[PDB]
Design a protein around this ligand. Sequence first.
Ligand SMILES: [Co+2]
Ligand SMILES: [Co+2]
Lengths: 332, 332
Amino acid sequence: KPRIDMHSHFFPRISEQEAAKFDANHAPWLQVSAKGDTGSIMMGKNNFRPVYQALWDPAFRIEEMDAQGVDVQVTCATPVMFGYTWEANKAAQWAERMNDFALEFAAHNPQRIKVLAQVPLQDLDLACKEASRAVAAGHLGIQIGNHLGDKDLDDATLEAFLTHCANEDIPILVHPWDMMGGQRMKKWMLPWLVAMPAETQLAILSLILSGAFERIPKSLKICFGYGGGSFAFLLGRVDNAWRHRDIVREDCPRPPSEYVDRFFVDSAVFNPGALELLVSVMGEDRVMLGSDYPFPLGEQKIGGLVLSSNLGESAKDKIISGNASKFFNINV
Amino acid sequence: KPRIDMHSHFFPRISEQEAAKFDANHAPWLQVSAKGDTGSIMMGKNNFRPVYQALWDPAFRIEEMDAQGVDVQVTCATPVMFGYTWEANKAAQWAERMNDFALEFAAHNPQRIKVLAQVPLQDLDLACKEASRAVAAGHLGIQIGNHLGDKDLDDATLEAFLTHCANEDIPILVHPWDMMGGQRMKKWMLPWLVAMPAETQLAILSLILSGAFERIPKSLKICFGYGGGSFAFLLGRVDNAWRHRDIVREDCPRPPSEYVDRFFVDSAVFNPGALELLVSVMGEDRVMLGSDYPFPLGEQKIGGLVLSSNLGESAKDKIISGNASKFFNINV
Ligand SMILES: [Co+2]
Ligand SMILES: [Co+2]
């Protein structure tokens, strides 16, 4: 059985002065130490995140997959590369540059490294073009942020994008980014612990309660990061509301929990009971191993949590291999 | 066996002028309709929120209690009553009558109807003043908003307040209000499904990761509303972050999951699996039955989820009744 990890990120070699050529405050670039082993994602002139080789260097990444026992890894852009706020033609350009970088990275060993495209989502026309092009060019689908400022997934532009992908049999992974919280969550990585899972839950819900899933064709393949946030756990609150308020029910014809057959989630929930509640709510067919490699708060032993749970033989196979094979049409 | 509902709310009978004497524009009052079965919480001259009778009628509440088999019920201010933005010294008094009004509602019957108080939390001194006098007066503890603007519970000022309450041996129910989200959660009661649980989780993690518990004594009896939100579901992720980053660990000397013996949660989670997972995280002694009566999104069949679960019979007894009596001081 081949182990598949479908949530991992990369960042290419981009010089400071080139990030500038797009935007001197918000275009990210990669400062690497001369040692070669480490560096940081930068932002204008500011440190954004400490990183290490496996992020940019595909050769190095292979050992680490050998070491982890990971055969096939589907990887994508680091969310900070998204460029969703920017002027649209630069973002469309930026995306095309990055999705090419990504193809290269994978070319090192295209059998074992698969990529996902980023798109200039603030512009529906350019975004569908990049989606279609980049999948022509090798990508197995797209990764988008869960929202566009105060447009959430129920917005018509975002729905139309999912609908473009649906119609072209292009899979989508949705990653939270640009977290709500303004000024309250500056210490202890709260943005990662509180805002992020709520962000993701809210992507799922914006689609459910807006009646979006009645409009998007049933053939869409859409997956949600980090177990779909707290979605599964708060699903009962959601149904309850739905049953007792017209305003909650107005746009959503079926109970919200009936819609769990319309998307997938990854496995990264960091706890045996959570994963089980998750697989319980979602079904063993809709969960995929993702690790969030190679970041500090990803699963440092990939598959560990699944490999050693109270779970089905076939279910574990589905989660570590089966599900993702189909979702991404990876020839097992 | 005597069922206790420790999460409910009231609004008082304040005459517009006898209210506006505080703020002609922002002090909330209650308008009682034609028949007498329906109302509206009014803001100065504005229609804020319509309301059914049991929010204001103690005599009527009793009948509904008897109909549910609730023997004792603890009720607190509706979040609109808070006024944590308001000029301290004014609210210091405004809180006082809110709390006297409360006692006035709990006068009709004290064996069965119990009160917690609100405070002018924006000024520490006035709030500490008020809590003590209000408890002395006959309130059983207090209810606070989870946050005050950008000021979360890791605040030395808030922390101080809680340490005060532990020392005077006063219990505290934490409720989420004034939800994060800016312009984003506008339909389908999204703030209540997403913002609310995130907020409650934020409040709990604020104490844990800030180190607040290594400075606040074991004597604080603090409960968090709505099952602690998504806290118990996401605990796995926090322990993982903590293990993997210095900034998560920097102020919290022990793994976050160990602090689960320093607080309580109510049980309003509206799902069998969620409840068991939550008791699995918190234990039978730290989960109390709360309905959120009389709001529509409260539990209809009060106690139903607990009584309908595969849990230890005496565990059931503790949620329903045992724990709350100890926690609040309710004669069995
Ligand atoms: Co990620
Ligand atoms: Co409430």
